Structure formats: structure tokens, C-alpha cells
Ligand binder design. Structure first.
Ligand SMILES: Nc1ncnc2c1ncn2[C@@H]1O[C@H](COP(=O)(O)O)[C@@H](OP(=O)(O)O)[C@H]1O
Ligand SMILES: [Cl-]
Ligand SMILES: [Cl-]
Ligand SMILES: [Cl-]
Ligand SMILES: [Cl-]
Ligand SMILES: [Cl-]
Ligand SMILES: [Cl-]
Ligand SMILES: [Cl-]
Ligand SMILES: [Cl-]
Ligand SMILES: [Cl-]
Ligand SMILES: [Zn+2]
Ligand SMILES: [Zn+2]
Ligand SMILES: [Zn+2]
Ligand SMILES: [Zn+2]
Ligand SMILES: [Zn+2]
Length: 283
């Protein structure tokens, strides 16, 4: 039997997903943690055995700390107990839902879009979830991915970094497009990164209407309060650094970077078609 629906943020890497999840973390109706790394796995033992991350990836540990007012050691002890009994991932999600209730979980990870079977698992575990599809211009994503030296994470450190980055953007976006094409229009909402940082009030107000929550001022203040970004920096990171703490406001200047970014190669024809579908211009 499926769990009550949650909210997913789906995106390519480097699309401002962390910024968005942190904005939403401020809303009293929502609970929006660093990556939980639950969705890709069937059981907690599978997760423990297979979950290897460049940084500490303590989203789940931090979640139990917040919702149960626990120190790090006690939260870890709880997670180890779930692993020892080998709870299903659905059982752990159910436990999270009860511990955050009446708040709704916001589940964000750019890695979900890399595997169509992971996207499908969301629909298998949950009923009537809502999907926020966050998109960013391919030039901006590619420049960032290459700058951050993420090519190794794909298992393609021997190929051209720019082409590897392009493939990540193209595959993630095509996978999301394919997945969402099968779902009710009423359960999906697109956000463009460029709009998010240039017009956050308008974007967030429209998102609030989609989520059926009222607007709260905290949405516009991602650097205020406890939004699970504090303490040891490496603890909220998983696959790379979103560079959220290298800024101190919603920084609009990062939107238009695509207007001047010079990539070594024109995007492949297939990538250009995806960009066209998403209404991005390619200078
Ligand atoms: N406060 C802020 N304002 C605007 N954009 C931000 C931001 N913090 C992070 N970002 C953008 O989000 C990107 C990371 O996205 P994600 O969280 O999906 O990995 C960053 O990549 P760069 O710092 O490499 O430019 C940056 O462009
Ligand atoms: Cl990323
Ligand atoms: Cl991320
Ligand atoms: Cl994940
Ligand atoms: Cl994972
Ligand atoms: Cl730590
Ligand atoms: Cl990141
Ligand atoms: Cl940072
Ligand atoms: Cl950060
Ligand atoms: Cl800034
Ligand atoms: Zn993960
Ligand atoms: Zn720690
Ligand atoms: Zn990221
Ligand atoms: Zn950082
Ligand atoms: Zn800045």
C-alpha cells in the first residue's frame, strides 16, 4: 500500500536545487532536508552497503536530529537500529512522515533524474505526489559541472569533461520529460532557475499555489534560521558542493551567465532539441 504523497524536486545537477530546497525549508508546512538517499534503495541494509558519497551526506542523520531533538550520536544509533532490523525504505519514509506530521516532506536530489527506474520508484511508494521540475540553461549547468570537476561521479573521467557534463544535463532532462509526460499535468510544476533567482517572489508565489500552501516570508530568506545548512559544512553535502554558503542572498547575477559562457564545442543536435523544448536560446 502506497504512502501519502510527498513533494519531489527533480533536476539536473547544478540547477540551483539546493537553493530551492533551502528556500522551502523555511516554510512552516514543509520539511525540506539535505539528500536522504532513500529512494534508490529497497531496504536499509542495501542502502548502508551501497551508499558511498564524496562528502558526509548526513541528510538522514540531520533529519532525525531536528524532528526528534537528538544529538548526532543518538540519531546515528537510531539509524543503525533501522539498518539492523533491515526496514524497507518505504517503512523509513513512513516513519519520517509521522515524525514531521503535519508538515509535508520535500525530497530533493539531482541523482533521481539519472535513472528512470528511480523516478518510477517514487510513484511505486507514494500516492499522488507532486513534482517540481527545476531547469537551468545547459550552458550554465555545463560550465558549473566542469568547473566543479564532477565528471568522475558519472564513471566517465576518461571522456571529454564538457561532453560528459552535456550528457548529464541532456539525460537528466530527457528522463524527467519522459517521466512527467505520463503524469497528470495537475501534479507537476516547472521552475526555471533563471526566473527563480531574478523573480523569486513571483516564482515562489506560483509554487505556493501549486503546493496549496500560503506564502510565508521565510521563503525569501534562505540564509535565516535553521535550514540544515549549519555546523560542519561537509555534513550537508553529498556528491559535490552546491556553493550555497559562498553567497549571502538569492544571487540574481548567476541567471544570465549563459549569455556569455563560451563552451569549446556547440551542443550536440540532440541536446539542442531538448533546449528548444525547454525554450532556452543558444547564442
Ligand atoms: N544563493 C544563491 N543564489 C543563486 N544561485 C545559487 C545560490 N547558491 C547556489 N546557487 C547556484 O546553484 C548551483 C548549484 O546547484 P545544485 O544545488 O543543484 O547543485 C550553484 O552552482 P555554481 O556555484 O557551480 O555556479 C549556483 O550557480
Ligand atoms: Cl549537483
Ligand atoms: Cl545538489
Ligand atoms: Cl539520492
Ligand atoms: Cl544514493
Ligand atoms: Cl560531521
Ligand atoms: Cl552539489
Ligand atoms: Cl559553500
Ligand atoms: Cl554549500
Ligand atoms: Cl551573494
Ligand atoms: Zn543519493
Ligand atoms: Zn557528522
Ligand atoms: Zn548539487
Ligand atoms: Zn558549500
Ligand atoms: Zn553571490
Amino acid at each position: 500500500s502506497r504512502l501519502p504523497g510527498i513533494i519531489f524536486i527533480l533536476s539536473s545537477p547544478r540547477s540551483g536545487s539546493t537553493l530551492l530546497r533551502v528556500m522551502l525549508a523555511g516554510h512552516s508546512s514543509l520539511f525540506s532536508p539535505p539528500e536522504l538517499h532513500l529512494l534508490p534503495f529497497n531496504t536499509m541494509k542495501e542502502r548502508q552497503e551501497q551508499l558511498n558519497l564524496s562528502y558526509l551526506g548526513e541528510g538522514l542523520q540531520k533529519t532525525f536530529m531536528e524532528v526528534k531533538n537528538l544529538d548526532a550520536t543518538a540519531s546515528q544509533a537510531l539509524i543503525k537500529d533501522l539498518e539492523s532490523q533491515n526496514l524497507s525504505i518505504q517503512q523509513v519514509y513512513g516513519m519520517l512522515q509521522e515524525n514531521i506530521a503535519p508538515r509535508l516532506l520535500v525530497d530533493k536530489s539531482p541523482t533521481y533524474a539519472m535513472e528512470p527506474t528511480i523516478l518510477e520508484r517514487g510513484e511505486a511508494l507514494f500516492a499522488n505526489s507532486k513534482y517540481i521540475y527545476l531547469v537551468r540553461h545547459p550552458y550554465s549547468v555545463i560550465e558549473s559541472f566542469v568547473r566543479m570537476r564532477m565528471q568522475k561521479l558519472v564513471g566517465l573521467g576518461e571522456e571529454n569533461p564538457y561532453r560528459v557534463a552535456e550528457q548529464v544535463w541532456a539525460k537528466s532532462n530527457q528522463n524527467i520529460l519522459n517521466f512527467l509526460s505520463q503524469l497528470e499535468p495537475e501534479r507537476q510544476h516547472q521552475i526555471r532557475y533563471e526566473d527563480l533567482v531574478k523573480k523569486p517572489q513571483q516564482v515562489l508565489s506560483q509554487l505556493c499555489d501549486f503546493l496549496n500552501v500560503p506564502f510565508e516570508p521565510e521563503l525569501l530568506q534562505p540564509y535565516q534560521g535553521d535550514r540544515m545548512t549549519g555546523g560542519v559544512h561537509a555534513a550537508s553535502l553529498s556528491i559535490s558542493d552546491p556553493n550555497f554558503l559562498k553567497h549571502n542572498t538569492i544571487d540574481e547575477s548567476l541567471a544570465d551567465k549563459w549569455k556569455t559562457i563560451q563552451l569549446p564545442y556547440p551542443l550536440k543536435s540532440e541536446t539542442q532539441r531538448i533546449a528548444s523544448q525547454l525554450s532556452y536560446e543558444l547564442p
